[PDB]
Design an enzyme around this catalytic site. Structure first.
Site, PDB file in Angstrom:
ATOM      1  N   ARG A  49     -32.811 -25.833   6.422  1.00 45.48           N
ATOM      2  CA  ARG A  49     -33.980 -26.087   6.439  1.00 45.48           C
ATOM      3  C   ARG A  49     -35.156 -25.552   5.504  1.00 45.48           C
ATOM      4  O   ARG A  49     -35.003 -24.487   4.941  1.00 45.48           O
ATOM      5  CB  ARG A  49     -34.562 -25.400   7.974  1.00 45.48           C
ATOM      6  CG  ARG A  49     -36.250 -25.594   8.246  1.00 45.48           C
ATOM      7  CD  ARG A  49     -36.494 -25.029   9.569  1.00 45.48           C
ATOM      8  NE  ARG A  49     -38.027 -24.619   9.756  1.00 45.48           N
ATOM      9  CZ  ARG A  49     -38.251 -23.730   9.774  1.00 45.48           C
ATOM     10  NH1 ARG A  49     -37.778 -22.510   9.871  1.00 45.48           N
ATOM     11  NH2 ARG A  49     -39.674 -23.498  10.189  1.00 45.48           N
ATOM     12  N   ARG A  90     -57.696 -22.641   8.901  1.00 48.66           N
ATOM     13  CA  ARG A  90     -57.992 -21.258   8.169  1.00 48.66           C
ATOM     14  C   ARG A  90     -59.562 -20.792   8.236  1.00 48.66           C
ATOM     15  O   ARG A  90     -60.409 -21.816   7.980  1.00 48.66           O
ATOM     16  CB  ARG A  90     -57.493 -21.230   6.873  1.00 48.66           C
ATOM     17  CG  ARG A  90     -55.860 -21.207   6.723  1.00 48.66           C
ATOM     18  CD  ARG A  90     -55.338 -20.101   5.666  1.00 48.66           C
ATOM     19  NE  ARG A  90     -54.023 -20.338   4.994  1.00 48.66           N
ATOM     20  CZ  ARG A  90     -52.731 -19.803   5.649  1.00 48.66           C
ATOM     21  NH1 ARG A  90     -52.770 -19.420   6.794  1.00 48.66           N
ATOM     22  NH2 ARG A  90     -51.701 -20.252   5.132  1.00 48.66           N
ATOM     23  N   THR A 296     -36.824 -19.716  16.840  1.00 44.11           N
ATOM     24  CA  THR A 296     -37.820 -18.599  16.402  1.00 44.11           C
ATOM     25  C   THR A 296     -37.629 -17.504  17.136  1.00 44.11           C
ATOM     26  O   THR A 296     -37.614 -17.336  18.224  1.00 44.11           O
ATOM     27  CB  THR A 296     -39.438 -19.144  16.553  1.00 44.11           C
ATOM     28  OG1 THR A 296     -39.513 -20.192  15.989  1.00 44.11           O
ATOM     29  CG2 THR A 296     -40.318 -18.044  16.086  1.00 44.11           C
TER      30      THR A 296
END
Ligand SMILES: O=P(O)(O)OC[C@H]1O[C@@](CO)(OP(=O)(O)O)[C@@H](O)[C@@H]1O
Ligand SMILES: O=P(O)(O)OC[C@H]1O[C@@](CO)(OP(=O)(O)O)[C@@H](O)[C@@H]1O
Lengths: 498, 498, 498, 498
Positions: A49, A90, A296
């Site tokens: 990945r 952001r 994760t």
């Protein structure tokens, strides 16, 4: 029952001669080198990945070349996945580089672009122009990994929100923000992604892990950006927020598979919920016959330590029990100390859980959930697996060029290895996300079209002999078309191996 | 099926008004203070564990006093558990304080006591006098957490083993050793333990977590060391090695409960096996009706961080799904940075998993596994729970003085809180390891013997009203004896609450 | 599975010490005498049926007196049932007493009352004034047991139908007619019935077998005709036609039980369908907890022969397997040669089938079909039976005055006798249609109200000892209220017998 | 559950386009004529039975010729079955032609052959020379259909038994006797049978219904009498006594099928037991995959009446529900008034029960009972049926020459017609006892060996189109070998029909 069965288990039961589950590794500074990659493959990596949130086309190209070179040296086929940066929210910059947010204080968050390089604790910029339309009084706005939690009090004006600071935290320039009770409506694909998707097509990547998928419409937009040249690339949809979970059936329909993207999902949705979401999403993918990935913090401590925590080991195992095709490694292989060891540990846990796995119950459970009638090829695959259980067949061989036939079989969870014989190399790579399947490439050009199917069949059987799955006198259950039928497999055979 | 059911789950499902699972905390330097302990209780601690491998009677006494003082201040009953040091195998001393073990080297391990203060990389002492009788050529000898792996080649003499060093590692004075393919035959109780058990009786501890239980005979020896004064103290048996796993049915018979002691078990048994062992042991305890604890590295990273890893969260949740009465905290509360937070996180995860839990399937599964005939009280409890499901009763009340009746009910996994009314305070503490149960103390002395049972019953119902489990018009299912019968409960009633 | 289980059966298995199923006998010329009735009771009759289609109040009174006298002499309680004549459709008279109907001929059927004493093969009267409104062209009109089948061609006028004769048959005066594709709308209760219902109330009969029930509304009309004086008489609804089958759920709701009246149903509905109707109706009654009776031609050949046919024996057995509370005898006891023998044969077959019966599967199957929640008393009964299976209890005792509690228990199919202790004699009779139940009368007047329940309980247990169901050391499962609750039983106890 | 399912049934459900169950007719004076036989076939007869207890070779030959002629005229294949007289026990003659047996009297039964033509009520001959060795004091001896019941008191001498007469009855010359508590040891095959078996071989009969089978050894003796010329004739074993029931597994092993011979079994075994025996025997045959027949008194009243009794209709239906391949007609077609009507009624009932039949549960139930593993062809058949249910396929085609493959498939109870394509005409006849199967003959000689299987397959599909089972776009599931494999079918295909 699952209970009674737990009772038949033993720690001293020998594990299998094959590992069904597949491991995905993210490639970073620790793992870019061909030598490192070779170590990873040997350790057990089936998919590499690349995360386009980090690096550049240039960096990622190196990875692609290195993967292909390492795989070539080892005589194996490794899928390459492009993991997009995706749309991000952001903050802007703060004066003095930094800004000290105190508990109880009032601050103002604005989308007025005049403020992008002159925020302060008093007022600063968030770069998502729709912020005001998407949030209401009472909603929470997370900044810095969700560390700083502001609460929305009111609309000071059409571009600015008056907020309360709910907990103290110093924040530096340009932190990511989340919006947990908010339907974020960024486009599916950013401008960088667009350049990102095209690059992926150009360098011939196998699959896309599409970040932040809110909708079925978004997947289509991804499919469309990939274009005609990109039509055979798989789109795997990462579920990382509220909308994605809500829209899962439609997303699953559009997609070629799902990722349970736990790190983002974990902020977006309360963490204790991620467990329910994991169970649901995996199951829906299993029922649908599409590959599903658990992601994760699976072996996080192994980023820095030689050995995992108990919670971690339990986590890899439960994901397999959950029914996942794949488990994934992120930081542990991207920037970690022990890349080979972490992968080796994951593989070992996967093999152990596999012993405990009741493959048979899983077959029947899946089978009951299919609509009847369905399709001739689907019945062939399901009943062929049933044949495997009935005879105790030790291997299975299927012919698939698209890879469709192979997923359809794997979907039924046989208790033996499945050997797919394919005329496409990309198919061999793409199948690296399907549990319990091994691919043999058959070069149609060199060896001919094999319309009577005898050659492809011989090769799959030989491969099975070679890896030791079968010996003479064993049954091998074989799936393909008969002489007339085209486009699917309408036939099953039980053959004795010599 | 578990599959179909996963499909009915949602992340947005509201959690319960009660948490069934119980949390155990080890008390160390971080948590000894009364203020810290108060924080722990509020955070969710039901049992406080003292590890007698560390500290001294003096240190542990402080803990006992502090627990009682903190509990008293908060008006709650907290169980106190004594966790024995147990028998240990250690190396002796090395010359220069240290000894540098290289891969490929030959070294000599001896039980000759002449060598306890003059080992060297060449030859050193291991203090287990039976080492030679227990090990054979080919066996492995682990030193330093299992970090240094020596392999046994031969008997140099009757007290000394010639070993190969299989991997490099510097080892300092007095490391612990393990013997994974070896039946270790240390006594159940060391001399310090003996002084340790007596102290526990003297200070009136609720339970013993008995380390390293190899056998049913050993439990008896523990029971016997506790003596007459100690007869009502529960012996919870920690399964940390091979022999203990092998002998589990007999150990479970003798014991009052089990701990799945993952940290030691994890070295002793290959780690990937600990998962099978967890599932088996928990299930056998559930079927037997005895409390079972899942231990070690459950939220390990939270020893140092504010937030857990994904693997960790998954681990606490799966333990509940597995069927455990209790989860445990070790270092995370003994020496950690965020003791209150770790406990709060564990409680939250437990509550979330509880929503996903199919309490009903669990009831039926357990019920099928019981042998017929069984016992009048057992039928009363099982059928009473069945009544709970049939009426949708929102609470349950049981009368138990020994605590026996309460375990018997909890065993059947009702989907509502169980309220136990007891005339013994120790019973209230001891029940802190039984899932899904809350205790109300009824002072027989002040309020009388209550032979007609009306008072104890009123108190349990009132407590249920008070915590909000029930309102008027709700059903409460009630269990006790009738007017004639003594020593068990032969009766169930469904009463409407006003 | 039923299959696997068939495999565990043996012809040499010993039968039970009790017969669960109940036998009903119709009383006619063969069985009216007290001596004959005594023979019937001894042979196994629990219910005596009087058919008001035959006889007169005077004849039937004799039966009532005789039943009571015979029962009294034998110290037993026998239910008395009144089986109404019900509404009938008949032809009128023909000239010369007779009329010769040929195949292919045209005839005219009229409801013009001018024709009641002057029909001919050409044109005759049918006494159902709504005939024309209920029938259409194509419909069939059956005359003489369904032997002569006329087909309706057209409405000659508003009172007369032109018919084809479909098969040859000579018919005499006043034959019964049926209308198989026709919703017959006679009132629920004829004028004779009305006088019939009142008489039944006056002579204090236990139940009514209500003929030809088309609807829920009709049952209510029956209930209403019985009046206040008649409120505790059970209305058992016979399903003999199309409408009754169609309306079964609503009829079952209104009723106290059902009869599967096969002889009429068999004409009305094609005969091969009666089997499906039997299975459905019995099951719906079992699920609902109401008594169900299988009727007609069950042992028909035994009207004239000492021994039954194979088909007959199979029929009594399958009715029990079907789940029926009762089997019935009609002509075989009313006018037959071997009344005692036929009953003895039926009892014997019932006992044999009972061995083959899987009482346990039946309990679980029934239990799954109940809606949750249901009721505290229902849970008590179901779980109490579950207790019976779990302990292998050899008897059961219940307190019921209305008889409600007893039906509720019997409904759950325990594998042991159920002993009901009742303060009403009528209850003892009424319970004669509930399978698996035996009644003990407790005279409240002589012995007091027994609020603490100890006396009634002692009597039921003693009765169980007396019939040999239990010996000392056996479990008896007991059901009643506790000291506070009134209106139902909220308690179960398992007691040891001395 | 069977219960829940009963609930989904309706009387108005349309019946199927095919009848699975097969009807067997005994040919007698009523049905011998070619015209009568033609009526029978059209009415629904698949098998014609000749009973060698009656008639002579000469009479039976006429039947054979007539069956073949009638079948030929109608273009159909009809199985011919030879039903042996078998060994019989008979009394001798009495003086005056008759003898008047009174209740309470003493009589003497002897096997002394001096007495065969001079019995009296005082002493007479029974022709079974082993009578004395087989019977003991207390045993019963039935004479005249079981009408006269003598009880054995003692051995007067080595050939004579002193008996009590238990009930009055006049008996004439040469009545049959039975021995219900007695193991009768007549040879399997009488001298007439031997001549009977040879004749059957000579005239080329399809199957033998072997009367009175006590043992597995006896079947072998039958097989052996048939000889080499007779090797492909099926031996169907009639279970008519105790020993046969007791020895059923071994008999089933040896046999090609079973008959539940209710008329004899009914005397031999108490009648109420015949029901348990029917359920067990049918189930064991279903599990084993061998044809099973339910026989005797099934529609008895129709020997004389146009319409059946309720018990009779219920009986034909329950036999189908029981799982029988075949139902049988005896007297109803041999000597009856309404041969065509009785058959038509039976067919109609069979079709109706078939609607109610849960073919799916039956498939799964059977499947669970098979040993795993089993055989490649067995898995192919079972899974192929599973394919039928999964796709909703409307027909099935199998290739069988022995007929083995066809039984193996039918065994799994698909919910659609099965079409067998065979190269043997006898196979077409032999398959007339297998439920749910239709045969198409393919003349290998005229059309070739068809090794690639395409022709036989086309013919089966065409036949399916022709009878209307399938239309274009329907699935047909097809079973045979692939190109290499010989002797069994290793392949399944789902093909779309055009
Ligand atoms: O590529 P998918 O779509 O899986 O199709 C493969 C199936 O199609 C077939 C039939 O067309 O391919 P092939 O022509 O290559 O032999 C089957 O043999 C094979 O099993
Ligand atoms: O302490 P355990 O052993 O659980 O026994 C409690 C049961 O015994 C009884 C009966 O003896 O106690 P109690 O006498 O205190 O009322 C029941 O009421 C109670 O439910």
């Amino acid at each position: 029952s699952q209970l009674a069965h737990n009772l038949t288990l033993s720690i001293f039961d020998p594990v299998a001669n094959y590992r069904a589950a597949r491991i995905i590794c993210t490639i970073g500074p620790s793992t870019q080198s061909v030598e490192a990659l070779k170590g990873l493959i040997q350790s057990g990596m089936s998919v590499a990945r690349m995360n386009f949130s980090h690096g550049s086309h240039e960096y990622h190209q190196t990875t692609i070349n290195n993967v292909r070179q390492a795989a070539a040296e080892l005589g194996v086929n490794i899928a390459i996945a492009l993991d997009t940066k995706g749309p991000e929210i952001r903050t802007g910059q703060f004066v003095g580089g930094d800004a000290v947010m105190e508990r109880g204080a009032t601050c103002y968050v604005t989308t007025d672009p005049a403020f992008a390089d002159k925020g302060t604790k008093d007022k600063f910029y968030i770069d998502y122009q729709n912020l005001s339309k998407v949030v209401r009084p009472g909603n929470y706005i997370y900044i810095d990994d969700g560390i700083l939690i502001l609460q929305v009090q009111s609309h000071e004006d059409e571009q600015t929100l008056e907020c309360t600071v709910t907990n103290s935290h110093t924040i530096s320039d340009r932190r990511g923000v989340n919006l947990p009770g908010c339907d974020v409506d960024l486009p599916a694909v950013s401008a960088k992604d667009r350049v990102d998707l095209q690059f992926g097509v150009e360098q011939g990547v196998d699959m896309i892990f599409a970040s932040f998928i809110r909708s079925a419409e978004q997947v289509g937009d991804v499919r469309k950006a990939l274009g005609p040249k990109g039509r055979d690339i798989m789109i795997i949809c990462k579920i990382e927020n509220h909308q994605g979970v809500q829209n899962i059936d439609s997303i699953i329909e559009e997609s070629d598979g799902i990722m349970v993207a736990r790190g983002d999902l974990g902020v977006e949705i309360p963490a204790e919920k991620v467990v329910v979401a994991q169970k649901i999403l995996i199951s829906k993918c299993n029922v649908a016959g599409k590959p599903v990935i658990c992601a994760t913090q699976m072996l996080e401590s192994m980023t820095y330590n030689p050995r995992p925590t108990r919670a971690e080991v339990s986590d890899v195992a439960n994901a397999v029990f959950n029914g996942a095709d794949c488990v994934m490694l992120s930081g542990e292989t991207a920037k970690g100390k022990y890349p080979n060891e972490v992968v080796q540990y994951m593989a070992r846990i996967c093999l152990e859980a596999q012993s405990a796995l009741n493959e048979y119950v899983f077959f029947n459970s899946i089978k009951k959930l299919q609509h009847i009638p369905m399709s001739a090829d689907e019945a062939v695959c399901s009943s062929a697996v049933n044949s495997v259980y009935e005879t105790k067949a030790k291997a299975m061989v299927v012919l698939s060029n698209t890879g469709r036939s192979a997923r359809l079989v794997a979907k039924y969870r046989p208790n033996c290895p499945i050997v797919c014989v394919t005329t496409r190399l990309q198919t061999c790579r793409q199948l690296n996300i399907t549990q319990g399947v091994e691919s043999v490439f058959f070069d149609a050009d060199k060896l001919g079209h094999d319309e009577g199917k005898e050659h492809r069949v011989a090769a799959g059987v030989e491969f099975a002999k070679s890896k030791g799955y079968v010996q003479t006198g064993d049954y091998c259950v074989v799936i393909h078309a008969d002489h007339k039928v085209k486009g699917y497999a309408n036939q099953t055979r039980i053959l004795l191996v010599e």
